[PDB]
């Protein structure tokens, strides 16, 4: 076979230990999922510094906690915009999931609260910037560099999917680089606890699996498709289904045809053809062997999965950090003062937040 006796037994034991880890992680998650935290701070506890990124419902700002002086990233959502965009359920998903998960590559939620106008989620500040910026600046990542990041996403999805959580918005814009060069996944706005199928048409066009575009009930395998898109974009510098307008992007995705740069290794192309697989009976991550089809693929042969989890692998890139609260690794955005009404808006819709 491919593995000798020693290698086979080591791999088997490793895979059993994964099951043991995930069973304990589920027990811990369920305790927090059934008894969530709420109202752990208030707005006047923080000084607002600078906008770090924007979204449809608001922005994320660097804030400084007045009492402790610690810096945080505060996501601000305008309740009125959330209701109009039918994102009430999604925003409740985001907060509930973030408060209950625990993994080295998932951003940590520290506080959450609401006022008359807005919802607030206060997270650890990750100063190294978005992967997106670094990728666009350099052009592309070499295969070992891309593989280091991809391995962290594989482990993060193995964790999330074991908890019946689908992520649904993988892309470089949502992956921050920490002070050690490791990934922090942010933006749980589309994450959802799903036992089997779900039906919402949501995500980012370039990263959507064909079954989403085709209005099928879909499952966690959409995240494994998106991993294929991410790995391709990291290694090529552009995604595999690339067009100016969403309708044109969707047409390319459902055709299934993928072309690869001549510099892609054959191992990489083989992995990507198995992730970017339109037939769900053949897509890696959706088969009997589960995540192991990905983790044991030749492209990951040099990956020490435990060492990645333990953050003991030397990172390919360490962001420059000029001190606590430095924002040099983030782009600039138009600033807008946070307005808080004298009247409570959308109170009944956000009671559980």
């Amino acid at each position: 076979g491919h593995m000798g006796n020693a290698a086979a037994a080591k791999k088997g034991s490793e895979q059993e230990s994964v099951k043991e880890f995930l069973a304990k992680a589920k027990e811990e998650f369920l305790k927090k999922w059934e008894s969530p935290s709420q109202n752990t701070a208030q707005l006047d506890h923080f000084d607002r510094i600078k906008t770090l990124g924007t979204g449809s419902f608001g922005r994320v700002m660097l804030v400084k906690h007045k009492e402790t002086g610690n810096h945080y990233a505060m996501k601000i959502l305008d309740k009125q915009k959330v209701v109009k965009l039918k994102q009430i359920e999604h925003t409740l998903n985001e907060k509930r999931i973030l408060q209950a998960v625990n993994f080295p590559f998932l951003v940590k939620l520290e506080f959450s609260f609401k006022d008359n106008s807005n919802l607030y989620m206060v997270m650890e500040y990750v100063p190294g910037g978005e992967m997106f910026s670094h990728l666009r600046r350099i052009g592309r990542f070499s295969e070992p560099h891309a593989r280091f990041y991809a391995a962290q996403i594989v482990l993060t999805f193995e964790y999330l999917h074991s908890l019946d959580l689908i992520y649904r918005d993988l892309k470089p814009e949502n992956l921050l680089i920490d002070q050690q060069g490791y990934i922090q996944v942010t933006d749980f706005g589309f994450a959802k606890r799903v036992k089997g199928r779900t039906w919402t048409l949501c995500g980012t066009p370039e990263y959507l699996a064909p079954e989403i575009i085709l209005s099928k009930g879909y499952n966690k395998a959409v995240d494994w498709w998106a991993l294929g898109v991410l790995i391709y974009e990291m290694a090529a510098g552009y995604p595999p289904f690339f067009a100016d307008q969403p309708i044109q992007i969707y047409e390319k995705i459902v055709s299934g045809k993928v072309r690869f740069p001549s510099h892609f290794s054959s191992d990489l192309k083989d992995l990507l053809r198995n992730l970017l697989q339109v037939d769900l009976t053949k897509r890696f991550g959706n088969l009997k062997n589960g995540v192991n089809d990905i983790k044991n693929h030749k492209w990951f042969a040099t990956t020490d999965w435990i060492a990645i989890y333990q953050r003991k692998v030397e990172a390919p890139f360490i962001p420059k950090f000029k001190g606590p609260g430095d924002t040099s690794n983030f782009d600039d955005y138009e600033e807008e003062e946070i307005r808080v009404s004298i009247n409570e808006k959308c109170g009944k819709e956000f009671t559980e937040f």
Binding site: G55, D169, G189, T204, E206, Y238
Partner: peptide, 13 residues
Amino acid sequence: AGRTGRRQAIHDI
């Protein structure tokens, strides 16, 4: 040709 700037999520169709 395609989109090189930051890409916003979509909530429907």
